[PDB]
Structures are given as C-alpha cells and as structure tokens.
Amino acid sequence: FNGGVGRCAQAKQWKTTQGRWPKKSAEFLLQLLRNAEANADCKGLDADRLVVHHIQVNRAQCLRRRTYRAHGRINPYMSSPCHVEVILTEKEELVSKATDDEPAKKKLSKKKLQRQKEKMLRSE
Amino acid sequence: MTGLTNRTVVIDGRGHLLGRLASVVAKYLLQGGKVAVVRCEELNLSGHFYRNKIKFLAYLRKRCNVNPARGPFHFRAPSRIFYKAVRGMIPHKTKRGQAALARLRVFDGIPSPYDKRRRVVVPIAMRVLTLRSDRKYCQVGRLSHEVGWHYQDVIKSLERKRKAKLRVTLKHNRELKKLTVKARENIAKAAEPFNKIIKSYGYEV
Amino acid sequence: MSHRKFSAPRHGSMAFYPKKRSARHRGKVKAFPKDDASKPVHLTCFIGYKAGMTHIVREADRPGSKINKKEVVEAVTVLETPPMIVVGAVGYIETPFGLRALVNVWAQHLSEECRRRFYKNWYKSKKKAFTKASKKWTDDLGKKSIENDFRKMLRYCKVIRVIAHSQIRLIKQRQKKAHVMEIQLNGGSIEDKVKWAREHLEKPIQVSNVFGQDEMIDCVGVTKGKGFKGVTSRWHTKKLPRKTHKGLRKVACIGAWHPSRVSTTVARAGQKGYHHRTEINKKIYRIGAGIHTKDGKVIKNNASTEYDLTDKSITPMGGFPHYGEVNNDFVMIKGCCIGSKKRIITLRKSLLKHTKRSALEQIK
RNA sequence: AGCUGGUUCCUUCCGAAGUUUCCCUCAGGAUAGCUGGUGCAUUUUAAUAAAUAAUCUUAUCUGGUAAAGCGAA
RNA sequence: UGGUAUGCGUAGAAGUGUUUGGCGUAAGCCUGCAUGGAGCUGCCAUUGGUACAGAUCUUGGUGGAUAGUAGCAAAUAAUCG
RNA sequence: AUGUCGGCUCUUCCUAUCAUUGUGAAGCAAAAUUCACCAAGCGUUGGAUUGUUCACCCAUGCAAGGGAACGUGAGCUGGGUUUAGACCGUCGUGAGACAGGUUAGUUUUACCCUACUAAUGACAAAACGUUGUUGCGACAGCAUUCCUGCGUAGUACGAGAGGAACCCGCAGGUACGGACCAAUGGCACAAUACUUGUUCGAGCGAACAGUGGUAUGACGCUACGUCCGUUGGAUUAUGCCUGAACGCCUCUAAGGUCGUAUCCGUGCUGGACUGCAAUGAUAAAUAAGGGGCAAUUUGCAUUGUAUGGCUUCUAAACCAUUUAAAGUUUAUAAUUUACUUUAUAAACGACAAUGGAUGUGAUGCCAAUGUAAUUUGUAACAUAGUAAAUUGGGAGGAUCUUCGAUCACCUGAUGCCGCGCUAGUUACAUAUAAAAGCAUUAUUUAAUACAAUGACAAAGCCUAGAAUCAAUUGUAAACGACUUUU
C-alpha cells in the first residue's frame, strides 16, 4: 500500500526505500502478541521458542460517517476496523521423511543392469 | 567450439561487403552456427567513400525529439555498424531473436584468443568476387571515423601489435612445417607403413 | 500556424541538461592535456578547497589596450591547496571499448584520512583496510607482487595516472574526509611515469611544481545546490504578468496539441544546482606560501606585495566566512570559480596553448 | 415522439435493399422491385418430346452514337 | 399445471463453491468432493411476469484513484505543568 | 462539445538565405548594393497607434528574411469577435433584426496515466560473491554570437569626388549561455538604536499595534555587479592538378589537391540504473566455527558431453595489400626488418582443379596385435624408434576475457621409478560378444570416457570485513538521498 507514503531511511534494513512508523497499528498488534504469550503459558508452551508463524489481517465492516462538502455534495468519511489474526508456534527440529522408486523390468532392461555389472569391468 | 558443426566460426571481415556478410551470418545464427566476426574495420561497403558518408549521416538526423535518449543509437564503431546490419535482418523484437544475437560476437581488429584462430572466408560475402570491376567502394572503418568513431586510431595500434605477434608465430609455423614434411618423407620409403596407406589412398591428398 | 512572430533566444542552453544532482564531488576530468613526450613528469592537477574571495588591485599592461598604466580592481578566489600525498599509481591500456585500468599499486603506509574515505562508519570500523596489501611489502617484494605489478604497467599501459590524496588535517574544516583523485602524469616516457610514481609513494608534492603565476588553469567544481526551485529562476523564463489566475511563476505554454508531446526543451522545474561543470581560462594571481617558523614565527607576508610591505597574511580579519583559518599553500585565482563554500574543486592545466595575450601577461 | 438509446438462449438452412411511384413528402410510410416461408399443379422440365424456361448461334427487324462529312441540307 | 415414474428425500432435499469424471457443434447436462438443513425432480401434454452485459438502465454492494494522494491551513496559539 | 482571434509566455523545425561563414555572377573600378550557391549553426529587435495578425510610423544596429505543428484559454488576458443590461444609425405596424458602431459583462478541475522535469531504488543477470573506493565511456544532448575602434588607411583602388575600419595583429563591447557574492547595489536578523500610541506604579529592560513605524543594518541569499565560453578532420559550395573521350585540348571520364558559421569529433553536459574495468578489506571471533582455494579430493548426488568405446572434435592454422591483366610461389644471382626489393628461368595461367582437411605442431574413430553399453592379457623377431619425475636462475607475454599475487620459453643442476613402449610380422590364451531374436529398433538404454555443479555426517589447506539505520555535519535537501561524523 505504497503511496503516497514518502520515505524513510530506516526501511533500508528491509531493503525498501518507503518506511513509516504507524504507531496505533503497532500497539494493537502488541496487545494481541501478549495475549497469545499469556495463552502460551497456560498451555505450558516454551516461551523462548515462540516464533510468530502466522499473522493474517483482513478487513472488518466499515463504520459510516459522511462529511459535507462544497456545492451541496455529501461524500462518505468511513472508518476502517480490522480483523487481526496471529498464531505462535514452538521451533521444530528438521523433519525429513522418504519416498520410493517403482522401476525397471524388461528386454534391454534386464540386460542393462545385469550385463553392465556382471561381465563388465568397472574402471575405478 | 562444440557444434552443429563448429560453434565458433571466426570470419574475416576483410573484403566482405557489409550486407552480403550480414545476411549470410543472420542465417547461420538462426541455424545455430554461433559466429564471431573479426576485423570489421577491414569490412567494406560498396558506393564511394563520400556516398557512404552522406548515407550514414542521414541517420544521425533521426532523433527522438522529446527525450532523444529513447531515440535512435547511432552506433559509431564498425563492429557496431556490422552489428546493426545483422540485427535488422534478424527479428530482434522476438525472444528467439535475442538468442540469435547472443550467438553473435563482433570485434574490430581481431583480439583474444581469436588471432591464432583461422579467419574463415564466406565467399558470397567477398567483395572482390561479387563486386564489378572499376566500381569504387568504401571501407566501413573510414566511414566510422567520420561519424565520430574515436577508436580508429586506437584499433590501428592494437592491430599492428597483434600483427607482430602473428608474424613471429607464422615464421616459426613455416619453419616447423618444413621439418614435419621431411620427417614423414624420410621414414616413408624406408619400410612400407607409409607406402601402404598413401598409395592405396593414391587420390591427390 | 502562428509563428513566434518575434524570433527569440531560447531560454537556457540544452548543453547542460538533463540537470541531475552530481554523484562524485571529486571532479572527473573528461579531458587531459595528452602526454607530449619530452616534458616534465608532473601531475596535471591538484585538489583545493574554497577559502573564499578577497578582492585585489594590479596595473594592467596589454599592448594596445587603453587599460594601460591604469590600475584595475578585480574579484578573487582563494583556494587552500595543502600538499597532496602520492599514495598510488594506476596504468591504463587503450582497448577498442575504452581505457581500462589493469593495475592499482599502493604505498606501504596509508595514513588515516586516506583510509577514512573507504569507510562511512569510522568508530565502528576495525580499520583493517589495507593490512594484507601492506603485507606484500614484507614478503619477497617484486618477485611475488609489487614490482611485478609495476612491470606490467611499464610493459603496456599507454596512460598512467597517480592516486593523490589531500591533507585535510591542515585545514580546520571538521571533515577529516580527505578526497581521492587520479591525476594524469604528462610525463615523456611511460617507463619514467611509473618510476617517479614509485618514488613519490608516501611523499608530498607541492603546488609550486605543477603551477606558475599567471598560468591558465581550469577550475572544476560541483555548483551550489539550492533546492527544488521555480521555473522562472531555473531556466530564466520571464515572470508572467500579475493578471495571472493561480500562480504567476510558471511557463505558460508547454507547446502544441500536435505533437502530443512534452518536449525536454521546455523550461521545467527540476534541479537548479549540484552540477559538475568545467570553466576554463582562469589566471593565477599568486601561488601563496603558507610556510612557517624557524625560531622566528613566520606566516609573514602572504598578503604582501612589493608595494604594500605590510606583513600578515591573505586571511581577512576574522578568518574567511564559513571556511577560514587558511594556514597553507594557496593558488589565488582570477575571480569566479565554480563551487560553493567548503567544496572540493580540482585545479587543472589548460588543455591548449592560449595565445590570448591577456594571458600571457606577467601581471604584478 | 416519424427521434436517440437499449431489447433478454443457441444451432441449422436460405438470405436482402438503399431503387420505382405518391405523399407539407425529403430523418417516415404506403406502393412496386428485391427476400423468406407456406405450399399447389405437372414432371418425358417424375418418382421402380413432336411440352418448355432462357442464354449462344442462326435467320429476320430496329437505331443516329463512335467514326466520318462540310468542294451534303 | 394436468398426468406419470407404485420418482427422489432429513440414512441429507433444494441451494451453492468446486483442476471430480464424462456427454453434446451449442444452447447446456450429469456426476464426484465440500458446505447444507427441508423439502425436491425427469418424462408426455398443458401456460407464462420465461433466460441479460449493456438501456447517460434501476436498486444494492465493491474496487483502482487512495491506509492515503485532496485535505482536515483564515481569526498569531500555544506552552510550563 | 476537438476550448474563436490577437497580444503576453514558451517550443522545435523548415527554407524558397536578408544578415553572419566559405563561395561563384555583375554593364562590382573603390565604396556600396544586386544575383545565385553550400548552408537554418547563429541573428531577425525597442516603441507610438490598432483588439489586430496584417498594417502604418519612429529609432538603432552591417542586417531588423519568409514559412510549418487555424501552436499555445485545468497558462493568462477576455480587449475584438460572440449571450443575458445598455445606447445609437438604418429598417420595421410591432415585437425585433443588423455578419453596423458603442459601453458593462463568473475563464471551473490534475492529487490519475503517460510524457517530461527533478528525486529514491530492489531482485536476479552473473563471460566467476559481498561491500566500499576508484574509474571508463557506450549512447544521447551540444553553443558561443556579432560589431565597432585602433590597424591594414588617406594606402590599395580611383581621372576626381572619394576609398576597402579589409584577413595578419590588437582592444573593447553586443547578443546568448554558465558561473560566482569580494566589492558595489538590493533584501530583512522582527539584530541594534530611535520614535509614536498603550501597558508593566515610575525606572531599567521589555510586551502589545498579527514583523508597529523609522534610520542603520550583519552570518546568508541575490542584482543592475563581476568572472568564464575550446580545437581539429571529413569535405560542400568552389578554385584546381594530371589526362582521355575528341591523335589534339580540356577541373573529370579513371586517378589526384585544397576547401564552409556545415557535419562529426576534440571539448562541454547526463552517465549504459546492475554495460564494464581496476583495487581493498573480505567477516561474524572461539564455549565457536564461519567463510576461502575449492579450480579441489572421497562415499554419494545433480547436470551436460558422447549417447552403443567414440556412431567425436579442434581458442595451431593458407599473407601484408592496392586490386579485375588485378595476382598465390619456388629456386638460382643480388636484397631485406618485412612471402620486401631487383634481374633471369619456371609455376596453382579468377580452368576442371580447388574448398574441407594437407586435420595442414599431418586430428580423429587412436592406444586397443579381438577396436569395446568388458577390458584384451601374455611370447618372439628384426627395422624404424619412443622416454617417466623434480628443483633453481635469467628474460617474456594479456584488446568484452572461462583465475594479469596467472600461464610460458630458455638455460643449468639433481638424482633414479625404468612407469609407459608404438607401428610391422608372427606365437599362446580367453571373458564380452550367443542383447531369444527370427519381427532386433521402439517406451529405445548406458559400463565407461571428458567437462561443470553439488553437498549430507566426516576427511585433507587459509583467514579473521563492513554496509545500512540511530545519533551527527551543511558544503545537502520537500521526503529518501547527497556530503561530513563519533
């Protein structure tokens, strides 16, 4: 939601020219992080290993005002409430897992493996 | 190198007519022959020095007035003039054509590893064969310097330096070539493993 | 199609556009007086700093001017030119694409303000540039690195330039950021150019060697940057008469329905100032000796003429405004030089031999 | 409202006209011509020609243009 | 809507989301899967307020402009705390 | 609903060129002007009146050429034209008309997109990361203009009257453009003083009069102030050589010379966002390890090559050219740095040949004496005849290039693994090969070979950055950014 956001030096950490400090938004995300941590202690989840793995913010139903404008025009002035969503998770150890290989039978195929190995010299 | 046939064909731009060479090269790039063209200052274009000078001057008149940096690049170098001639003959607006341009390398005054390489002739491109007797012709490097090519002076020194390394290698090559033919000839008759294959070939080598 | 009807002179020359803010304060020469074999093995240029402007008086000679035997009072510039330290040598080969540097070779000891350039955060920096390159000098020398690099430069390199470095500490400008330039050695013989450079490592070269009183010099600076400004100030378009609805200081007419096209050539609001510019044929009044001190404490007679006798120095009462202790070797230049207060300007040898008899006057 | 705008699924097959006349007609109709559909009567032009329709040719008429004429009106 | 398949159906109807599978030149159809909760459909005839993209269409909703660009600037205008 | 005309402002081009450059004509003697050419690079103005382009005048300057985008109303103005008020002449019964005069009469919107002007900048691409510093110059734009005085000059030239303000050379200014603020000038620090009105009891010193007024007025900005604006080639116009057509002759047909304010570079300006080069440090610090040479080396993996060893491949390599009798060479006799130069004799006499290979340092597909989706192993003869390793020193090379703290060559020394041997002819033995298949191509392979890349745990070498943000400068600026900083 880039424009007409001017520019801040301090977003060069994130490699992007355009930064803002939007204080009210940051406070509400803070509250809900602390709620989730409080919930985490109740479940007996490890405090150190909490990483945020999901935040999803979606738009809530607008509250309606209307301001009254030049030449008897009325045009809406609307507030934007949010649906904020957060999920915290514990840091997991590297999960691998394994799959098959349903390969070869045949005419040149039996003769592939078996000749190439058996009566074939394998140079180092 | 590795190709359908040779991935590098080093082509001598000497005594080639500019559009004749450009068109045959354009075909070769589309075919996947990946060619390098060297000595584009030695490249010739028919029509008197003066006639070419005025033709080439007509484009710089062409200039995108609003921002001329969107506007037509009037490529001074003989290598880049060759490059423009090939590029126009190729559909360079397509991604196929981009591949084909990348297959092409263009150098004025044969550098790096290309000098111990043989500069192949394209005989259709040859000016001496195709062009009629007593017809005056222009040399592209002369034309280049008029339209503002800085490096006419520069390449001439670099070419002379190259020619000198190319002279000493030639001299030793010719000396070596004598001594290789005697070393075949003297062992040849002296048993028969050279008499067997040469005279059973017996063609004319 | 109405004409201009009165044919007018196009406000603002197209040959300084497109007016974008300057990248490098260390002015990049576009041009050097070749290397005409025979002559000195001296640096074409020096980096100086503006100390400002003094005002001066001299008798003017030129045959047949009627400025003859009458004094003329002339605007002045005063540039702080403290002896540049040669710290390196670069040699360039002409290739058909352009001049390519092969080699930069460095003085064993690079002295802090010469290192400061390489760093934008000095107090967090470990200062470890150039530890390992100075360690070339510990080992074997030119049999593994240093003279092998220099030899390569002798072998081909058609043009040799010397990396020369400002003593900013001598100027009480709070910068500390001494400024790097490459300066072409005009010197007859390529081989001699490198050799004088090897010798010149960690050695200072004074202003006096390259330059002489009443020599023609070019002064090359970035200009005064002065904001986003109005169309009227920038391109020198005539201010629309006061009857103008909603904003008198524009350019009225971009142009013409056909072509459907804003031309560049139309006076627009965009950067007026911060531009590299070379102005050429600025004469030397004086090369001023900063000198100093045996037991009798000099800085005496820097503002001195044979006619004044009155000691002191070029320093105006209350040290030059914004700049100003000005303790040093100076080049006093004939009066208006490109570049603001506290700025880097490179002083240069004139490209060509001025028969323009106002200089060759030896003025006193 | 003879005007302007819009008119709601598809496929198949055939397929126009801006012309005639009259009209306060001439931004429109009616009317004729062109169009489709519905078929009907007979096929030697039809179901397992000695009857034509309309294009050449031929035979038989017409014409005042091109050209020619002005020492033909 | 008349008739009918002794039609289907809360053991999941209709509705609807749907890289389920397929049919038809198409109009369009069926089916799977998920959601669902109370009713519904095919065929033959029978009637229409019968199928939409538009009409400076209507009515409701929603974007880009723009999480912010216009601006929220006249009467100085606060401020310590 | 495509915003009339002019004037203000601002753009670029065009010539059919008035001036300026370089030139050809002249019934051009000089001066002067006229004609025509290459030429639009550079000028072409300040006013009175008109709404006026147009027009008409005045004044200067050598000269006050003409056109195109009915340019240009979210640029202005709204003056003429062309609304609603209005007056008058004419006409009309009247209303009302008039393309007839006259007067007053709302110029709305950009914050989108593009263009443009300025301002930040990411990713990857990787003909070899990061980051910083330093550079190149592709490409685009492009600019200096004109006069006068002195001088050539009372001369050339002219019977005279007059008369080259004429290039060399010299000084100044003009017009244009770009800088710079020292002086000089301009502005106000609401600085300092003074002053009025009011208020703080008076006083000091202030406050209020939305900067109270007034005089002066700095850091700073900025003028009308001052300073600075390069130099060649190509060649047009054109004047010309040599010389045929046309025995001759001729600036032209061939060949050849000089030659523009042109053009294009030099120069001047942006700087290819990452097009490219050079160079530096190359981390993270140890209870750690991290990166680096990794081009590496191993299990193993990925991918290309050749794909049935291999049914491939090649950065030595047919010159140095005017060029269509132009020309590639050898040898003898001379000559040279140069297949250069000279005389004799020949020769591939743009043939067919030749153009693939002489694979032109005689490659391959060979080694393999069974040549292969096994490798051949082992014996003799005689001829031709092969070589494996290491270290030191002296000099040399690099044009967008696969490692310029790299790769050679030569010369000397050290010793001894004898590791390989090949071709020819000939002996001895054998696995693959018998891939079922009579239709063997079909879904169409890979042991191996070579080249690159990888990285799980591990292994074998080396080395110990900074950038950006905060804070900071003012040389910088709307904000990023720039320049400084600890």
Curated annotation (Swiss-Prot), chain A:
| GO CC annotation terms, alphabetical | cytosolic large ribosomal subunit; cytosolic ribosome
* Any Gene Ontology biological process: cytoplasmic translation
Residues that the record marks as modified (Phosphothreonine) are T99
One GO molecular-function entry: structural constituent of ribosome
* Alphabetical keyword list: Phosphoprotein, Ribonucleoprotein, Ribosomal protein
Region of interest: Disordered = 97-124
Could you tell me which residues carry Phosphoserine?
A: S96
Say which domain of life the source belongs to: Eukaryota
Task: Please give the family membership noted in the entry.
Answer: Belongs to the universal ribosomal protein uL22 family.
Q: What is this protein called?
A: Large ribosomal subunit protein uL22
Q: Which lineage is the organism of this entry classified under, starting from the top rank?
A: Eukaryota, Metazoa, Ecdysozoa, Arthropoda, Hexapoda
Q: Which gene encodes it?
A: RpL17
Report which part of the complete sequence is shown.
Answer: 63 to 186 of 186
UniProtKB/Swiss-Prot annotation, chain B:
Gene3D superfamilies, per database record: 6.10.250.3250, Ribosomal protein L13
Alphabetical GO biological process terms: cytoplasmic translation; negative regulation of translation
Matching entries from SUPFAM superfamilies are given as: Ribosomal protein L13
Output this protein's name: Large ribosomal subunit protein uL13
Family (UniProt): Belongs to the universal ribosomal protein uL13 family.
NCBIfam families per UniProt: L13_A_E
**Coiled-coil regions listed in the entry:** none
Which InterPro entries does the entry mention? Ribosomal_uL13, Ribosomal_uL13_CS, Ribosomal_uL13_euk/arc, Ribosomal_uL13_sf
Record bears the keyword 4Fe-4S: no
Q: Which organism is it from?
A: Drosophila melanogaster (Fruit fly)
Parts of the chain that traverse the membrane: none
Q: Which PROSITE patterns match?
A: RIBOSOMAL_L13
The protein's UniProt keywords, in alphabetical order, are: Ribonucleoprotein, Ribosomal protein
Any one GO CC term of this protein is: ribosome
Entry's Pfam families? Answer: Ribosomal_L13
**Could you give a GO molecular-function term held by this entry?**
structural constituent of ribosome
Q: Which PANTHER family match?
A: LARGE RIBOSOMAL SUBUNIT PROTEIN UL13, RIBOSOMAL PROTEIN L13
Curated annotation (Swiss-Prot), chain C:
Say what the protein does.
The L3 protein is a component of the large subunit of cytoplasmic ribosomes.
Which PANTHER family does UniProt cross-reference here? 60S RIBOSOMAL PROTEIN L3-RELATED (PTHR11363), LARGE RIBOSOMAL SUBUNIT PROTEIN UL3 (PTHR11363:SF5)
What superkingdom heads the lineage?
A: Eukaryota
Listed under GO biological process in this entry are: cytoplasmic translation; translation
Q: Which cysteines are joined by disulfide bonds?
A: none
Q: Mostly located where? A: cytoplasm
Q: Which UniProt keywords apply?
A: Cytoplasm, Ribonucleoprotein, Ribosomal protein
Q: What is this protein called?
A: Large ribosomal subunit protein uL3
Subcellular location(s) of the protein: Cytoplasm
PROSITE patterns from the xrefs?
A: RIBOSOMAL_L3 (PS00474)
Q: Which residues form a coiled coil?
A: none
User: Which SUPFAM superfamilies does UniProt cross-reference here?
Assistant: Translation proteins
Which GO molecular function, any one, fits this protein according to its record? RNA binding
According to its UniProt entry, this protein's organism is Drosophila melanogaster (Fruit fly)
The entry's family comment says: Belongs to the universal ribosomal protein uL3 family.
